[PDB]
């Protein structure tokens, strides 16, 4: 009923639940520098998942993620959300893509549309074109079409951006 794509003895699940084994999941963790990404990387490295971690900034921000995985299970990559070639290099050998990319404030290079909507579309379209089976993009709890502002003028742009991003993904 549910077909198995890999049919390679090196690619199947083997061993016990420790870090040195392999669980058959090759996961690419977008936004692994941040707050959720450390716990996601540790929970993946507890089960022996080979992880590709793409970082957009410095190497010292993601040098702390080598602890979670074993030797050969952590592979760093350099990407940008304005460049689809680096994302295409990142997810070309991945079965699982996790999207933790988000930002709570406006930035001079990336707006809310540029990080929650358009960057998510670039990641999701490149992952669909690369043959990735799963995509576990996150969202917010109170996402709506027109979220009314409670206190400030110009607020709830983040919730609308996450809502538009989740329907476009």
């Amino acid at each position: 009923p549910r077909p198995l794509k890999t049919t390679n003895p090196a690619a199947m699940k083997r061993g016990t639940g420790g870090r040195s084994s392999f669980n058959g999941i090759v996961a690419t963790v977008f936004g692994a520098t941040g707050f959720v990404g450390r716990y996601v990387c540790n929970k993946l490295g507890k089960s022996g998942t080979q992880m590709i971690l793409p970082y957009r900034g410095d190497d010292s921000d993601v040098i702390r993620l080598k602890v979670t995985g074993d030797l050969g299970q952590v592979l760093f990559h350099f990407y940008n959300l304005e460049d689809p070639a680096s994302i295409r290099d990142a997810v070309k050998h991945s079965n699982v893509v996790i999207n933790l990319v988000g930002r709570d404030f406006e930035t001079k290079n990336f707006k809310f549309k540029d990080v929650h909507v358009n960057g998510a579309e670039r990641i999701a379209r490149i992952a669909r074109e690369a043959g990735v089976e799963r995509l576990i993009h996150l969202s917010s709890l109170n996402v709506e079409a027109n979220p009314k502002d409670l206190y400030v003028k110009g607020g709830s742009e983040w919730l609308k951006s996450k809502y538009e991003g989740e329907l476009r993904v």
Partner: peptide, 11 residues
């Protein structure tokens, strides 16, 4: 080779 300010400009 460590770069932080250029990364801040391109983040």
């Amino acid at each position: 080779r460590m770069k932080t300010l250029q990364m801040w400009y391109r983040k």
